[PDB]
Design a protein around this ligand. Structure first.
Ligand SMILES: NC(=O)C1=CN([C@@H]2O[C@H](COP(=O)(O)OP(=O)(O)OC[C@H]3O[C@@H](n4cnc5c(N)ncnc54)[C@H](OP(=O)(O)O)[C@@H]3O)[C@@H](O)[C@H]2O)C=CC1
Ligand SMILES: NC(=O)C1=CN([C@@H]2O[C@H](COP(=O)(O)OP(=O)(O)OC[C@H]3O[C@@H](n4cnc5c(N)ncnc54)[C@H](OP(=O)(O)O)[C@@H]3O)[C@@H](O)[C@H]2O)C=CC1
Ligand SMILES: COc1cc(C[C@H]2CO[C@H](c3ccc(O)c(OC)c3)[C@H]2CO)ccc1O
Ligand SMILES: COc1cc(C[C@H]2CO[C@H](c3ccc(O)c(OC)c3)[C@H]2CO)ccc1O
Lengths: 309, 309
């Protein structure tokens, strides 16, 4: 049994990773930080993990030796540290975890908080959205400068943020009548249910094939244009939506006058839906999750969207 | 089948009431308000309610007719509106719901957002804590002035906020080595698991016996002093805690200088643990939930605390 510590265990993707690790059979440890306080939903998530068999490990990012003691207990560390401007964007806090892993010396593999666009490919990214990738790159550089073996999990839009809303911004539900189409809407995007992302992570974290590699989550039936996604919804509903195409220059108009988190979102949507950054390069079968783990029957977006009917 | 609308469906107790209504067999409707935006946990809670058979009703407290339309769909309305200063304290927003219920005219019973200390008994309360009971009394006045049939569910500390922490403030986990005891620790307090509170609510809302009544949740095995509660934990863990007794005067010292939500918390804990407001009066079996619904095998506090080992 691989021993796994999840740091960020009550996070959006973090809690899914905890559950998927348990379902995979890993001996699953979860870091419980003392600053929780009155955050009742966090406390009760930890209780729910214990009932599923997770082991609680107490530690604080402000207490270096507590982090050393935590990672000494496991073979693999997975980090799901926050990385979204409108939530919190604390990627660089992981540098303390890396340093603890360095001193501990026993960790066979570290999966840092990636789970999105492939940061070394985003050097051209618009600020402040670029902060996400610069910060993940600083963490990558610290990992490699510490000699820590790694797997970087990248390449898919979380279905809840990009599919269930037909990719409309500042909402998480399909629009009732009108939808904005980015450009012509024929740029391929990668979509994945976050529980599948979690299961691929649980499967890849002790896979010799992915030691010191980037693992792409690119399930082929889930590579879709925004128009193709919208047409899935239109079939499910029996109603066509009124589509308005937004040219690039109009999408980015006056971006510098927006709130920073909205600026970051616009910049990211630009790279995904206008530049096609998730599909503008190809990846081999030996570095793509759905090929590596064909037993994962990943949820297709027609099934995903049916939840919203 | 009884049709129930839950308003506050994604709340802490509200989400438990939704699930309990569904388990009880009620045709369960949930109010989904339009402003959720990027609140992904709320959105996914509603999606999880659909998966259990709940029916989504859209409406807004700023759209009076939407509230009228929502309550026309059902026989019973249950409100779980917020009522905690450090979360949010929007009890009086229910006044708009009472108006809509009054105009609708079909509602057989309204359970407003009570679920705590018995407001009519708290006329002496310390402000700002007293705001909670003043505002709940204002809602009771509106309900009764409108002739709306009601049930008021009162009388127990939620186990998460009072039992799982051995009643220590500003934490939700049992303390490691030391514990503060309020006074002599010999004042009886009522504790109940929140899932039981929800199950009692789902059973009582169409029970003729509680029509136009206050129903108390006072399960006899869960009437415990703080010292009895602590001694359960010591027995479960096999370790005595170092106890510091805090006199009433020192617990309240300098209250006026603290932040308002902490002042509220201090005032409530004072009424509960020093004045014994939950046990300083008897209630008959005909108005006590565990007697009315003896098929609820309520969770005792030793089994509750066992979750924390
Ligand atoms: N479409 C996509 O591909 C998406 C990509 N992502 C990426 O997923 C990764 C995780 O993001 P997400 O799930 O939204 O994360 P969250 O916003 O849910 O935060 C995850 C965890 O970060 C921990 N955390 C936050 N701040 C601190 C801090 N100062 N110190 C210590 N711990 C902290 C917390 O851990 P604890 O549980 O211990 O409290 C928290 O639960 C990110 O890299 C993000 O960029 C995110 C959404 C979409
Ligand atoms: N120990 C005890 O006995 C305890 C008693 N209570 C009492 O329980 C009741 C519910 O409290 P709790 O579960 O903590 O509540 P929450 O803080 O979880 O709030 C409940 C719901 O209130 C709705 N809400 C909040 N603000 C507004 C607003 N401006 N307009 C419309 N709706 C709003 C939201 O509904 P939506 O889902 O639509 O978003 C929210 O989910 C309170 O009366 C409280 O005093 C609570 C804790 C301990
Ligand atoms: C749905 O509306 C929004 C949705 C988001 C989603 C945010 C989701 O987490 C996304 C994300 C972060 C880092 C990534 O590498 C990524 O790759 C797909 C996605 C963010 C993209 O801006 C941001 C702003 C919005 O208005
Ligand atoms: C555990 O630490 C705390 C616990 C609480 C209780 C919060 C949530 O509601 C508890 C509560 C509220 C209203 C009530 O009528 C009630 O019990 C009857 C309990 C709140 C009491 O102040 C408050 C402050 C704290 O620091």
């Amino acid at each position: 049994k691989t021993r796994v510590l999840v740091v960020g265990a009550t996070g959006y993707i973090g809690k899914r990773i905890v559950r998927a690790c348990l379902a995979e059979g890993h001996e699953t440890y979860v870091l419980q930080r003392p600053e929780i306080g009155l955050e009742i939903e966090k406390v009760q998530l930890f209780l729910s993990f214990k009932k599923l068999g997770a082991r609680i490990v107490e530690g604080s990012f402000s207490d270096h030796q507590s982090l050393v003691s935590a990672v000494k207990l496991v073979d693999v560390v997975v980090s799901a540290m926050s990385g979204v401007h409108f939530r919190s964007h604390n990627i660089l806090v992981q540098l303390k975890l890396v340093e603890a892993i360095k001193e501990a010396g026993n960790v066979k593999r570290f999966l840092p908080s990636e789970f999105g666009m492939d940061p070394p490919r985003m050097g051209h990214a618009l600020p402040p959205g670029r902060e996400t990738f610069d910060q993940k790159m600083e963490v990558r550089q610290a990992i490699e400068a510490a000699g820590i073996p790694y797997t970087y999990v990248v390449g898919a839009c979380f279905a809840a943020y990009f599919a269930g809303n037909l990719s409309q911004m500042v909402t998480l539900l399909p629009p009732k009548e009108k939808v904005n189409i980015y450009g012509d809407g024929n740029v391929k995007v990668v979509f994945a249910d976050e529980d599948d992302i979690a299961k691929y992570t649980a499967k890849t974290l002790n896979d010799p094939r992915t030691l010191n590699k980037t693992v792409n989550i690119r399930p082929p039936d889930n590579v879709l244009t925004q128009l193709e996604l919208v047409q899935i919804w239109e079939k499910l509903t029996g109603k066509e939506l009124e589509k308005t195409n937004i040219a690039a220059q109009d999408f980015l108009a006056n971006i510098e006058q927006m709130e920073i988190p909205h600026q970051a979102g616009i910049g990211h949507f630009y790279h995904i839906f206008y530049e096609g950054c998730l599909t503008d390069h190809e990846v081999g079968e030996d570095e793509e999750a759905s090929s590596l783990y064909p037993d994962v029957k990943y949820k297709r977006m027609d099934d995903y969207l049916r939840m919203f009917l």
